[PDB]
Amino acid sequence: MIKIPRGTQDILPEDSKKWRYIENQLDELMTFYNYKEIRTPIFESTDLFAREMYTFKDKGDRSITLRPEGTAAVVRSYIEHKMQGNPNQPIKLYYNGPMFRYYRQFNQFGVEAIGAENPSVDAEVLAMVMHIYQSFGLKHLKLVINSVGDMASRKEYNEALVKHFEPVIHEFCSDCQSRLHTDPMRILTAPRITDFLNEESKAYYEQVKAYLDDLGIPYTEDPNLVRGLDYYTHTAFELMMDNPNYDGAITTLCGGGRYNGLLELLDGPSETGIGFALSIERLLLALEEEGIELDIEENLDLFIVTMGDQADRYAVKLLNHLRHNGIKADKDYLQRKIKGQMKQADRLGAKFTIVIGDQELENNKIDVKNMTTGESETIELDALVEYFKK
Amino acid sequence: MIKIPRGTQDILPEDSKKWRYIENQLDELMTFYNYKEIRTPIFESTDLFAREMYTFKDKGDRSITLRPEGTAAVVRSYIEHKMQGNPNQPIKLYYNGPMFRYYRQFNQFGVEAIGAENPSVDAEVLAMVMHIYQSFGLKHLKLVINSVGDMASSKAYYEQVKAYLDDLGIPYTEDPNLVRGLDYYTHTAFELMMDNPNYDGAITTLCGGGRYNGLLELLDGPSETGIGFALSIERLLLALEEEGIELDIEENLDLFIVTMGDQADRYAVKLLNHLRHNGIKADKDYLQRKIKGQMKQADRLGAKFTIVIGDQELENNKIDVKNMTTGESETIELDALVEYFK
The missing domain is CATH 3.40.50.800 (Anticodon-binding domain)
Structure with a gap:
């Protein structure tokens, strides 16, 4: 007999109903927030993700690749359809489908708000990531945020890492050595990014938290919750589940943040944007560990x-x-x-x-x-x- | 800029809602009929479909393949999970997802009732193929059936299926020429046609399917009988267009x-x-x-x-x-x- 591929599973009749319940509930929540669904192809030009993966010179020897995540494709679609010129902004889009990273096949859900750098937007996506999980009854959640400032702060913080690391640059592999000059942060005792927020960046962040306080959303500031990718700006967050039956008792349920520079690497406008991604499999398991049953x-x-x-x-x-x-x-x-x-x-x-x-x-x-x-x-x-x- | 792969399209915010309406209506309909959803991986061992397509020796040089249709995968799952031994029979399953044929990516929906060769079952799936389409308001439908007898070749089976269709008040056209060469296609073979001026011939095939006895064994499984059908959500969407139908979106x-x-x-x-x-x-x-x-x-x-x-x-x-x-x-x-x- 023929067996499914390794690291791959079928969602059989007992679970499919649980998936549909969750999937349907997320489509509804998006309705309240006004995010619209987009469905990108299972594969994209390898060159989008080029910026292990299942790549194959098919499509007429052309190199294609099973998408490992949905952000680049939402961006590739946003660019290709010239959404920047849409009268309706910010572009608030969401997706939900299988991703492929060599389970080799997993199902991630995510949202992307592009074209409106604004604390109130950030708050909307943070209140949402909280709303999603709370709508299912999960309860030992813990939202963790941080800010890596703007492009300015990062520029002046990068220089500090070079002042720092450079005098001992040869003690580092050619890997880390190359990286001093393009983005020292990837090299990471030495300076911390969060000590370089300028005045504006420090007020955006204060507004985001202000809003969280307003909406009554609790959060933990983890100064060390940063992202090296230089196109990652301001708000960074991670929603977490405190659950003892976990490897190390804690699990990250969801994660995301703002970015400025992503679109341009994909040959697009300098639009700002924020988004997050979440795994339906993990959400499912969270309900399990918390001992939760769905009205199926x-x-x-x-x-x-x-x-x-x-x-x-x-x-x-x-x-x-x-x-x-x-x-x-x-x-x-x-x-x-x-x-x-x-x-x-x-x-x-x-x-x-x-x-x-x-x-x-x-x-x-x-x-x-x-x-x-x-x-x-x-x-x-x-x-x-x-x-x-009747 | 980087462009979408050839023969591939995105389902943007204006249509995603139409897809969700249809998809949701189908899961409900399946509810009434009692078919349960199964979701198979996007790819399978090339050797399943082996029994063009996007094949690649990945997975550790292992040859895998972007599935071209969902029947062999439902059967591959059915076998692997030893469903033939399930106390609840016939196994009534459905699916809905992207298929890949060398649009290269299309979204086919379909059902499979395995383990109960019985006219009343064929009647149930034909009544459903008509129901699905009728539930959206399509109107110039035309169900066409035929039978290629049993493997020994039945006739009374076929007369019973049509007996039932007559019972149920389902109109049908017997097309002697609607047959399928695959020797594991045992009895009934059908297609739902939609007569509409906009298509070449002024009719189009909306859905198609039928029984089979011999498929399971090619896939290394039991001699179970089975019936099923497949349908394109894209074509269904287009059919609503041509008929000038709007969904309650x-x-x-x-x-x-x-x-x-x-x-x-x-x-x-x-x-x-x-x-x-x-x-x-x-x-x-x-x-x-x-x-x-x-x-x-x-x-x-x-x-x-x-x-x-x-x-x-x-x-x-x-x-x-x-x-x-x-x-x-x-x-x-x-x-x-x-x-x-x-």
Whole structure:
């Protein structure tokens, strides 16, 4: 037999419902925040991610690559569709789909607000990342933020790292050595970025936290929560779950921050932007560890047990009827004995059951047995759709 | 600039909503029929589809392949998870996701009922293929069926399936010439056609599928019988277009907050957070613009209502909630805002 690829899993019927619940809930939340969904191809030109991955000179020897994350593609689409010129700004977009980093296949969800550097925007995305997780009932969350200032602060902070490291530059590998001159931060005792926020940067950050205080969102400032990528500006954050059944008891549920320089590396405008990404798998596991259950009703409303051909052929029209009316119903293919049909009813979670036989077919009346209370209710056969509908 | 791969397209904010409407309607329909969703990886061992395509010796020089369709993967899962031994049969499963054929990326949706060769089951899937399309308002549908008998070749099977179709009141066209060469395609083979002047021939194939006995074994599995069908969400979308159909979408903002100066604006931030925590779709103005500009954005976003918070309103604790269509204002206390919108 053929086996799935390594580091790959199928989401089978027991879990698919949990995924759809989560996915649907996120689409709704985005509705309140007004972020719109975009769906990028599974692969992009290798040259987008060039700026391990599954690359293959296919597409006519052209090099393509299974996307490892959705930001570059949201940016590649934003640029290609000339969104910078959109009358509606900031461009508030979200995505949700499988990513591929050599599980080799994982499902990340994320948002990107591009075109509006503004503390109130940051606050909106932070209140949101909190809202998402709290909407599911998670509770031992802990939002951690920091600021790496603007492009100015970073320029003057980089110089300090060079003043610092350079006099011992040869003690570093050609790797780290090369990096003194392009971005010392990647070299990282020595200076800290957060001690270089200018006056403006220090007020943006103070406004972001002001807002968090306003909205009553608790946060932890972790001066050491920084990002080396020079196109990463201002707000940086990580949402975390305190949970003892974790490797080291703590886990990062979500993460993100602002950026200024990303778009230009992808051949685009100097737009500013903020976003975050989150894994549905991890969210799912968080609910697990916290011992949380989702309102996934996954139950058949009516299972039809039939006796003999006449009654059975009637169950066919009936089923078609009920299904055309939003009732979840199912009958017995496989032709089995009542015990077997009744068990199937039970297996499928049939809230109710009915046994149609020829006597019921004539009297035009069946007993609808509530499978939990085991209480029957006698109604006319015609009522069936009506009775279940209402 | 870097460009999208050839024969590939993005589903931007104006369409993603149409996709979600359809996708969501299909999961519900599947609910009534009792088909459960399964999600297979984007790629499989080349050797499954081996039984052009994007194949690459990755995964550690191992040969993998971007799946071209979802049937062999549902069967690969079915076998690997030893579903044949499941107490609940037939295995009724569905899927919906991107497929890759050398648009190179297309999004096919489909069902598979495995383990119960039975006319009443074929009837159930044909009634469904008709239901799905009818649920969206399409109207010039035309179900075409045929049967290629059993592997020994049945007739009565086929007469029963059509018996049922007649029972159910489902009209069909028997096309003797609608057959499939694959010897594991046992009985019924069908296609849902849509007659519409816009397509060449003035008809198009919306959906297609049928039974099979021999597929499972090629994939190293049991001799289970199975029926199924596949469908393109893109084509379905286009069908609604051609028939001139609109979906009950219209993503429209509930409230756009226009603010005057810092005080008012910093108030709009708690307000927003509040409303959003209550199922109200609201948005304010980042980008700091003139009222005319904020008012246009409100219009741009489809804001059903609008409010302008400024310091005077901030003290009087009262604002005029103008209905953006009638242009009629309603003055309420600022506190009511959330309560009033809820």
